[PDB]
Enzyme design. Sequence first.
Site, short mmCIF file in Angstrom:
data_model
loop_
_atom_site.label_atom_id
_atom_site.label_comp_id
_atom_site.label_asym_id
_atom_site.label_seq_id
_atom_site.Cartn_x
_atom_site.Cartn_y
_atom_site.Cartn_z
N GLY I 29 -1.65 -7.65 1.03
CA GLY I 29 -1.64 -6.58 -0.24
C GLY I 29 -0.61 -7.21 -1.40
O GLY I 29 0.28 -7.85 -1.02
N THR I 30 -0.69 -6.25 -2.44
CA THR I 30 0.37 -6.85 -3.37
C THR I 30 1.71 -5.85 -3.08
O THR I 30 1.90 -5.36 -2.24
CB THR I 30 -0.25 -6.01 -4.97
OG1 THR I 30 0.11 -4.76 -4.75
CG2 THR I 30 -1.49 -6.44 -5.28
N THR I 31 2.68 -6.71 -3.93
CA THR I 31 4.17 -5.88 -3.49
C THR I 31 4.39 -4.72 -4.10
O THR I 31 4.05 -4.35 -5.02
CB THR I 31 4.99 -7.14 -4.20
OG1 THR I 31 4.62 -8.40 -3.89
CG2 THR I 31 6.64 -6.69 -3.48
#
Lengths: 111, 250, 240, 195, 241, 244, 231, 235, 243
Positions: I29-31
């Site tokens: 996933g994204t940060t």
Amino acid sequence: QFNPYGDNGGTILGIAGEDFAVLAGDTRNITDYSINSRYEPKVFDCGDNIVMSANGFAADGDALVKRFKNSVKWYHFDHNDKKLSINSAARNIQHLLYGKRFFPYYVHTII
Amino acid sequence: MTDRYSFSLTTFSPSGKLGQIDYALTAVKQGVTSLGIKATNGVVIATEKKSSSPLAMSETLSKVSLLTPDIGAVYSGMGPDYRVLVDKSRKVAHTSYKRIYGEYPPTKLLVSEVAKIMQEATQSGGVRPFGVSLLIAGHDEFNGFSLYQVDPSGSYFPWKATAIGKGSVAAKTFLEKRWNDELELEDAIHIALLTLKESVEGEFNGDTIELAIIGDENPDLLGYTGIPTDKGPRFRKLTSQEINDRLEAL
Amino acid sequence: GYDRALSIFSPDGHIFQVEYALEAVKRGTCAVGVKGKNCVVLGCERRSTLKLQDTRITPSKVSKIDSHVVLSFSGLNADSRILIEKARVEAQSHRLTLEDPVTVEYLTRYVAGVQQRYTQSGGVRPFGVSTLIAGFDPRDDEPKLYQTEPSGIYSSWSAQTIGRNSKTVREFLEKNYDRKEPPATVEECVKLTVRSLLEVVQTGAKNIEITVVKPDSDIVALSSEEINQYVTQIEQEKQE
Amino acid sequence: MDIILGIRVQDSVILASSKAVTRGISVLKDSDDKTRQLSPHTLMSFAGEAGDTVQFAEYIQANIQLYSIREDYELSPQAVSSFVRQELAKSIRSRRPYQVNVLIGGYDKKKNKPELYQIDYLGTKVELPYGAHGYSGFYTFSLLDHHYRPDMTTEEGLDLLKLCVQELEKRMPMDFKGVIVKIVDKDGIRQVDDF
Amino acid sequence: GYDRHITIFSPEGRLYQVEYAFKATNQTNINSLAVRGKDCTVVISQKKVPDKLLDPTTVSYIFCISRTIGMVVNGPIPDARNAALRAKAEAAEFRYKYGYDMPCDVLAKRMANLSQIYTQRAYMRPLGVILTFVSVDEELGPSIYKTDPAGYYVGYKATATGPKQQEITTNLENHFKKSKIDHINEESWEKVVEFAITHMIDALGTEFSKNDLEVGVATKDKFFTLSAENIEERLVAIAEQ
Amino acid sequence: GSRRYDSRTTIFSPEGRLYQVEYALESISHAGTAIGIMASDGIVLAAERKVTSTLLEQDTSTEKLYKLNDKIAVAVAGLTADAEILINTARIHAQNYLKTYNEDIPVEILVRRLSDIKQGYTQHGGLRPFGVSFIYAGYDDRYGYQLYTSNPSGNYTGWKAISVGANTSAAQTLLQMDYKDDMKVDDAIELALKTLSKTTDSSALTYDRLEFATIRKGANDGEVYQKIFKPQEIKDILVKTGIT
Amino acid sequence: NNYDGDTVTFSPTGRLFQVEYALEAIKQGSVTVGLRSNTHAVLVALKRNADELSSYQKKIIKCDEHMGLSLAGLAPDARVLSNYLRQQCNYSSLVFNRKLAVERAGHLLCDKAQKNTQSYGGRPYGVGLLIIGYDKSGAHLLEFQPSGNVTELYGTAIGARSQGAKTYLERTLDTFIKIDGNPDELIKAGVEAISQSLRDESLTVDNLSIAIVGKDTPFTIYDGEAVAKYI
Amino acid sequence: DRGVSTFSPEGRLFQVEYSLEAIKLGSTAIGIATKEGVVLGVEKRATSPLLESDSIEKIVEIDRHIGCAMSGLTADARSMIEHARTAAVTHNLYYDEDINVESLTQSVCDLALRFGELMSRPFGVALLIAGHDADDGYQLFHAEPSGTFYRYNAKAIGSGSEGAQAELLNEWHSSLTLKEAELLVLKILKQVMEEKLDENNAQLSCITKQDGFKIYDNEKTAELIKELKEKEAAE
Amino acid sequence: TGYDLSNSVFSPDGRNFQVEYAVKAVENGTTSIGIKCNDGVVFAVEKLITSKLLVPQKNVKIQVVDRHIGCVYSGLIPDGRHLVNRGREEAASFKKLYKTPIPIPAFADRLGQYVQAHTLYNSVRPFGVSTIFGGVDKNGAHLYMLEPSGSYWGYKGAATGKGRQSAKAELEKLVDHHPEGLSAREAVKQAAKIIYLAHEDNKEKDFELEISWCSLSETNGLHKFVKGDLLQEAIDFAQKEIN
Ligand SMILES: [Cl-]
């Protein structure tokens, strides 16, 4: 003991012509000897050229009209936008009313 | 969520064996030896207290348990399974008998109720069988003294004397040579201690051995006086000191 | 509750549990139904690997559902009791609400519906049973014979057989039964039924059961000697 | 509903039940049969609350007929009466109890004896030589105490029954429109058409 | 071999899921120790905070179950907190139902029974934790009772749990062989805590700063944990002797 | 989910057999043999205890023969624990009938209901079947003396003489050989013991490895008596027929 | 492979294959396009038939007077989800006298789809939806995926060869967003968008399906001779 | 094994796809819609000559204005018909009117996907639902166990479907008379059937606004069969 | 083997492979990050702009619980929403019974126990998200990070997603350089910088920055989104540092 019913007064009247129909009602709303509103409408356009009034106990009257208006909406959703005829509306309202046979809507209804 | 295991985990194999019951009996075989001997005026049940650590207080872990004032139980196999069975057994003696008849159940019927509980763990959904064999000793007015073995299947058998667990094969043979129908309770305790020494390896004293009897009524252990018909529990757990006294004249 | 879908479709579009239930029917003892001009006769095989039987008390192969309808079967015996019980309860329930006994078609339709329900309900296996249901509708003299099977399908038959070696006796009935002229009497109908079983059975001793149903709740089971007379008569005409 | 009577004689049980069905100030029917055949040799008459009576009678009838088909056998009058009693004993502690009183007349074929059972809506069962439900008993019991003998014939029982109906027709306030009489014996159940 | 996936018996009468839950116990790589004084029960556990971004005050494996009962866990924190919440609820219900504080040994038995159920019922996994309960019981006095994923439980004179548990166990055994008694013959809890740390140092062979340790102390009518400065005060006392 | 671990106890084989029922019957074939013989004036029940130990308490023991009511008894072959579950159900069912109709339950009705319970475990619920076969011995005033058997499938049948458990094939051949219809109880007692003695897997048939019972009208006038034999009575009847 | 038996199982790389297989059912579905300006929102859908004797599967469903969607994938699943939206819109009207915000409609669909991806026995929904609406914050377009992911967009497309229309709308973004107060032009842009996804077939009169909602326009669907204007 | 509601890697439900194979094994059913009415015809396909063919009931009335034909595991259809009849009558009770054919079909199709781990498996039968209402006139619907329904001008289902459908593609036009449709069903049934077509192994039916749903007699169909054979020989 | 095919099954190591497999979904996933400050907490997240067609500012990922708690997560976005819906139910019932708004440590355990419960049975799947959350209560500011196993701790700074290692390194520098504390307005600026620096591990698609914060002085102890001038100021600060 709590009494779930009240009487909001007022009166309604329906007459049918050859190519038209009227549904009239006074705009007064009362409890006991007091006036609640001089203009509180109780005759409503429910769509599909059907007008309706449920007069007596206003809370039950509003609840019924609200449920029938909703019934018209779902009749369109479920039967390809077909127009609800006045005879079919009448039969539908019978089932709305009789559904509460043992705790009735305290109203006289005219469409 | 919710228990989706509504199906049996014990089922018949092509040869007709019930796998989980057989494997439960294998767990009992690994368990520490326990035994029971029936005398004319009493019953003795005994076992070794296998300590898990010398820092552990083995007095806090009781392998021999009172079920009713006249019935006691010991086991071989999985301790935790035994502990919860004792809880259920104590309760069922009340709910399905004492609260109905105003008296404690006879040994055979309490045994029957425990056996039922163990049978249901063999057939009901989403459970394994209990990994224990029980030896239940008791007394009641119309049957006198009795000794029963209950296995993981739910089967139970009455015994004059028997052993279960680690060295049960040798211990049973030892008991066959010594048992007669005229044994007095003190003679049965003596034979119980002799039989147990064969299977015990390390220390053999009142702190490593657990032993209880079903014998005479104990008015001193009742806790009250005034009712003539109430005369006290026939179940008594022998103290560490009482065991050592008998180990000198061994 | 146990929920598992036991009856499911396979890649080729078969429901194997329903089809394997048909194999249980194929293992069962042979049962045959033949309807005449004024009667229906139900014949049943009884295997003779069981001597020392008590025939007074042993469950009979043909069961009365009501005073005017009977049910025979092929397959698992234990399974059939559940269907028979439900059918008998529905028979009384129908009399209670409709004030008229069931038609043979209706009773069949109910039993068949029960069987179908056990093919798409979770946690149950299909019935390992096919039934022959015969009788006469109230105030009617036209004979009725119906067949059901584990899948739930049912149909009417002039004559039909189910169970082991049923394909052999069906072959016999297919050339020996004339649609234009069904067995005109009781004797003719019983004989054709006994003949058809003798193609498959073995000895005509205590291996064949015969039950005759006539109009207006007239049902009777034949005894050994009565059946044995048909067996004796058929064999003497055969040696020709 | 209202009048149901029963007399057990030497070889039979005779049941008499009033024909009137009244609602308000109107006799709606004068030919009502207040009875159901439970089995070939067992008859049940009934009286009580409107609706409840027939509903209960037919429910019992269905159960006994179901039993008959299942076992290919007829239950004894004693067995049927016990089944009926238990159903009423259950009913009395229900949310809405069956307000139905019954008489069960049966001929036990194994014993070769007639049997009459009186059961009220509470589930109170008694075996009797003669029975009645409702206000009828207040006249008929004393009458039968005097004229009844245990060794009477069916004909003597019918004459004894005529005496009861005559007394009720003289002293009862309501017009019950006569009775339907039925006989239960070794040969089953039959109706007397001219009473 | 589905007998290794759920809690049913293997051919040799074993429960592999229970055995593998025991191995999950050491996943945190932390050692705990419990000893009894005259008036108290002391439990100590290692505190390893590897990440610099962690708030060290929130990293704990010691729990205050009730006013009187404390519990240290050996195993992963999710299962540890699961056990702690249930123990707190059970202890609270006991007091409400029976009118007196739940004893340490009774809570231990109850939690052990719950654990036993997971070894017998298929839909529930065992918790991969070992629970050490401590108190000064009003009847039994200083008490240490320990629970495992098998549903086993027993009382202890003293105990240790973790990867290097055996070293600590024998160290304690050898002391009680020498002292000839069931407990630490000391008046104040402060010196019993000092004893506990001293013998953990000897057994593990490591030195501890104030942030490498975690200490719980049970006295009559209360169980409490020590702050970093309370432990530092304790570490100074050991060093000056 | 849990599908992975489901044995599917209530399914058909490709041949149209019920796996679990067949395997339960295989289990029962290793259980001690039990024999029922119906005579004109009574019924005999005879059963062999499973390999006994000398320290087993023989008199206060019950393994094979159980009382359902005063008129009906059963001989058991299979898992005893499973049998007791069913026996208690059968005992309650008999009392329900007596409470409802004020008459003792007819034998077949009791047998059918117990057999229907067994049937249920083979069609629905996903549970293993009961690993038990019964021999029912009883009396009622409709059919008089009756013998029945039921097995894990829930199928039941009536018999003049029958065996369940181990060595039924050999036992049935022996019963089929020496049985006749005008037989008396005392003759049936002898046939039962003679058959067990020849089919036994033990060295010699003794009193301590047997359970025995009779259901006679040998009470006083038109009433039935159940006699569960005591150890000494089995010892005597074994001597009286010359087996020991 | 071994991790695609049910939705409750993660793969070793953290994938949910049953959800991905449900996503695949959308890719096989007939193309549908969504786009909006500041005043109106428009759905355009290519309908699919079984053969020349059959009708063309309806792709667009009305949810309220101010909201509706188009579907690609399993049509019965769209019926279930649209019915749920009809009820939620309706609950908001009856209880709060409030038209359901198109954003909340998206949040509600996300959560309903999600529950079917975390429990045993169930399956993911096998349909994608494009929801358009006009509420108190103007015109809106949402894209629903049965993974649970809902996304608000100026324009988009789902179904077979949807990438063509999606690229076109990405180029046309600055043009069609400012088609304010002109319904017929916004539709024309959507009809030109869906044309970039056609192969061998062209838009006919019983093939094309258009829907529009906006400032002074209730959600209404056009089929048959009413779409002949746009071919 | 595997879940009943599992998706394949191609994005289809295994059980629904497998039930479609069961329907291909079923007997042929054909429907043709005209402006004068809708005709429904089926192959009876008796498994044995002793079976009384008139007891084979594969064409069924739902209401006066709606009829239904089936193909596949026909025992599965009973509860579908029961639901259809109740839905039709219930709507008349609630609204004092006839229910639309499409609304009826949608109601039947709502049952379809109500399976899983609700019933244990999908239905193994396809339905042809034919009827008339005032709004949309004469209509023919094909209801599948997927829960999907298409309106058709003409449709064949069962073992001979793909061959019969190709034939219906050529023959159907928007001006067919009822009589022309009747003959066309008989013609196409005779082509795809195994045994020779006659009045005993095939059944015709129709729904018209005036007379409602009617199953034809064996005498009436026999004359249409004779009329068909004569017309094919006449050129 | 086969130990990894079913949730709640222990492997011979004592591990639940299904949870570890859920962690892989989080790493994909994204940060997203969290920074604890003087009197509050700051949350920030990377929103990948997949296409021009995404409406800017209109796919909000940070979520509020009650009126004082903020939640952000990386991984399966629907799973995160399910967890927040539960969190809102938990917070509502706490406030219903006890009147006071739910404390952050109390709230943390509510989520923790719920996530842990999804590792107990094979009939449920573990959560495919790591959730960073926190706020201000009576005892001051708290920041938490919760993982698929149900494991959570208090944090000075927290990071998860594809650029977690880059963000962690940057977080550790702030903790070292500011022992006394970081201000709320400073933490907002730093949050922007760290998301931009963590974007290097996801640099194919360009992104949209989203920030929120709770502060006793700056937001009066309530959760608010950073918008307009304060957001652009934070973006500019971040843009200056990458060059
Ligand atoms: Cl407990």
